[PDB]
Design a protein around this ligand. Sequence first.
Ligand SMILES: [Mg+2]
Ligand SMILES: [Mg+2]
Ligand SMILES: [Mg+2]
Ligand SMILES: [Mg+2]
Lengths: 140, 148, 108, 97, 155, 43, 40, 71, 59
Amino acid sequence: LRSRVTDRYWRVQEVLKHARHFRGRKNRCYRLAVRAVTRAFVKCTRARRLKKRSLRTLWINRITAASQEHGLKYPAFIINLIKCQVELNRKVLADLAIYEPKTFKSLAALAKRRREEGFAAALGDGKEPDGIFSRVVQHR
Amino acid sequence: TARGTASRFLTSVLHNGLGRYVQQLQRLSFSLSRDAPSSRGAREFVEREVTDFARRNPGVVIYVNPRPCCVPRVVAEYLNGAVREESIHCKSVEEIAALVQKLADQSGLDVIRIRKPFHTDSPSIQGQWHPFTNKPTTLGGLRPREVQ
Amino acid sequence: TYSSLPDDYNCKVELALTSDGRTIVCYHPSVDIPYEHTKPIPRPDPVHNIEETHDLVLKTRLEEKGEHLEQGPMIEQLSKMFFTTKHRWYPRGQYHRRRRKPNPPKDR
Amino acid sequence: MTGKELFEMWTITNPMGLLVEELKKRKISAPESRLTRQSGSTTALPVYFVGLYCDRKLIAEGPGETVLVAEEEAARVALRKLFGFTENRRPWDYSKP
Amino acid sequence: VPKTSLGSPPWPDIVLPDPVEETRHHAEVVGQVNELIAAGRYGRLFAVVHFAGHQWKVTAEDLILIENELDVACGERIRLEKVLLVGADNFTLLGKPLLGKELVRVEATVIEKTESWPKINMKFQKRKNYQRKRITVNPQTVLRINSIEIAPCLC
Amino acid sequence: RNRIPGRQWIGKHRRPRPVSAQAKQNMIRRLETEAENQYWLSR
Amino acid sequence: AGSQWRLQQGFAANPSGYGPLTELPDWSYADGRPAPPMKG
Amino acid sequence: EKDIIKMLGLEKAHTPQVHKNIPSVNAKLKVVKHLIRIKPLKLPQGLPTEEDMANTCLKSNGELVVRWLLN
Amino acid sequence: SSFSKAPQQWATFARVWYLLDGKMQPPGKLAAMASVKLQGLHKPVYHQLSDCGDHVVIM
Ligand SMILES: [Mg+2]
Ligand SMILES: [Mg+2]
Ligand SMILES: [Mg+2]
Ligand SMILES: [Mg+2]
């Protein structure tokens, strides 16, 4: 009983459909397309992993831009926003910087105030003076 | 691959869910067979729980066609005119129910890469950033090296 | 009065804490540009091509301004005018022209 | 109307004229156009910010590629503020009364 | 007193307001914001909320996509309880780290319960004959943020 | 111009890469943690 | 970041650790009835 | 060291595990003391009772609270 | 805020000319901030693909 493959057209097309937009003979020749499609998929997975890092770096750059525009550095802004128990991530912070300039300026003012209170507390080394924005609110 | 396929932005059909929610599934056509072994799941679905689905969703017209077909199919036509054809070939009744409920829940838009997980109109409340939004003004609007 | 940031650029930030202490409020009204910080709009209106003998010819002289240059000098002029490089203005082949999306997606 | 502006569907011709008529109705004399901010003027792609002052009080400000376009945009912004079609206005109420 | 380069710190000296005056000014500002809210002079409100492990900055009439399936039917209304930030053209309320349920109320209607496009996951090892191909179809939900309300219960 | 004979990190002549203040601080932090651990493991 | 500050104040080093931002339910029905509990 | 870590139940990192303060386990903790952080378990509200098993939590600072987010 | 689409775009992505006096200044400290301004890393709307970049004039 001789058996031969009859769906090889569809087997080839299933791979060739993912390489139509390539350049050279990789979009036509099956031998050169299978290798190029596999590399394309591997790069797709790696870039899916790296997209989050790239977007986080972009958001951090935008936050640095806005903070320096408000006369404040990014590490200070972030640490003082954390100390004020404001848990807004970098994506939301960049969104506010781009689209909510007044809200971002208010956040920068709050961060600078918290930094000033921390500096004053460190200079005084006194337990009884407590900052107005340096108070910690526990879970209720 | 995102670069190889198409893409679209997140959107709703005719501002669905804003004033009221309108189900986007318009019609559901089952094509099955009365004796093919591959249509057994579709036959059991039609016997048992097509009426319950029809009563639960009165906004969708359900047609059932027993014809001499080898593969059973379901055709979902949406308010957009979009047609989604699925194969219910050799599937359990629970699988048919899950597929039908998924078709009913879907909005009928193309299932392709969505550029953003969000979409809003006029997101620039209280302004949008421009290079002059955070720069102080000088008296008379003079340039840095301009003498009045 | 007190403010961490100067109130000179587009909003006046006033921070406060609620009595419970669990909420930080801030009032930031917008700031308008004062009249003394602006300058009058400059007006440019000059018709030096007018002729006292033939107004139709005067209008034609001012409306028939044309100039032509080679690709090299034209691209150099465009780059100098838009502060770019000469490489931006050179065309592209069929392989790159036909692979552009005819209907790109649009937001908003 | 979601996501749409007022003048996109109105398509008026003389925003400054409409604004001056509305101000006359509202008992305001006339808006004065002042160049508030600018960035580049000898370049091929300038930007100008033109504000409208009524009794030396800013009522609107608009950007443009040229001074005339900026003034027209400022007039449109003033008209939108007067008519209540601001971008930060109250969203339409979708509730059962 | 000598005045050398290193005799004084290279930053402006900061003086902070006295605590009682600061508290009085804070009370005045809170009262003004509360009276604005009571009068309802705010035009449009945006809110930063926490939902499904992510923080979204959403306004009214908004659309958001959640990468997991919810236990609701389409067209159902849902109250987003975790609101970290509220803002308008004039005022802005921050949580520490969350706001009050009685203070802010955000409603979203479920629109579409669908599945994502097929995402490719392929692992390949050089000259080891290891290839592994997988297809990911993540269920997704669409939420339409309808309204954001704030109450004058702001102390 | 300044070649490193052999490999960078294995040969007799290696790359003279120095120790940084960050590395010193990290080692000091680890030493403090281990000292606390060995104190808690005493009684 | 501020993990050291959070540890000093007593909170988790990660904002996703046993805080009210994650312990509480993040949605409920508009009718007021509670939502089904989260698997996490 | 790998086997001691495995038998101490510390296969996963950054997950605290409660152990006794007896020398039998102190020997293994001494063996792998350079890979672990050891703290004392503090109980401000006593041992969790049978009616408080499901409402407890372990803070990052080491006290096991008995009533965690009541109501 | 209530700008039309095109003027809002122009205002957001408009180019800005900055001045920088280089008298008795370290060239490296001049160049760092000049390069930041040239790239546009001082804009919250900055992106690598976007052409957001301002002119710097150093005297
Ligand atoms: Mg992951
Ligand atoms: Mg070598
Ligand atoms: Mg060597
Ligand atoms: Mg998990």
